[PDB]
């Protein structure tokens, strides 16, 4: 008939579980080089390329 | 300042002297003067080149 509840405490560990993420394939697939810095402080709204003759 | 008096023998004594009277003129703070401007944080990444000037 030992009573030892109050000999320990309840621990939350420090550390979390995985979460749900949304995989990201639009975002790694499309091109990223191109508009890269290309809006700034001198730019304004937006900005244009060149299309191909 | 000082007035006199102007008398055959010159004894004042049926008469009034001059009494000591102190003014002052004073100097106060005024309004502030201030010019104050605001802009959006969006503004300064695409509009605000040069702000400096």
Same mark, same amino acid.
């Given at each position: 008939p030992?009573? /030892?509840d109050s000999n320990v405490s309840q621990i939350v /560990?420090?550390?979390?579980?995985p979460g749900f993420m949304s995989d /990201?394939? /639009?975002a790694k697939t499309v091109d990223r080089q191109l508009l890269a810095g290309e809006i700034n402080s001198s730019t304004g709204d937006s900005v244009s390329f060149k299309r191909p003759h | 300042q000082f007035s006199s008096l102007r008398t055959?023998?010159?004894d004042?004594?049926?008469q009034n002297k001059n009494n000591l009277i102190s003014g002052k003129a004073t100097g106060r703070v005024g309004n502030y003067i201030t010019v104050a401007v605001e802009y959006q944080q969006l503004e300064e990444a695409i509009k605000?080149?040069?702000?400096?000037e």
């Open positions: 030992n009573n /030892l /560990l420090k550390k979390f579980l /990201l394939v /639009l | 055959p023998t010159g004042i004594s049926g605000l080149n040069q702000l400096e």
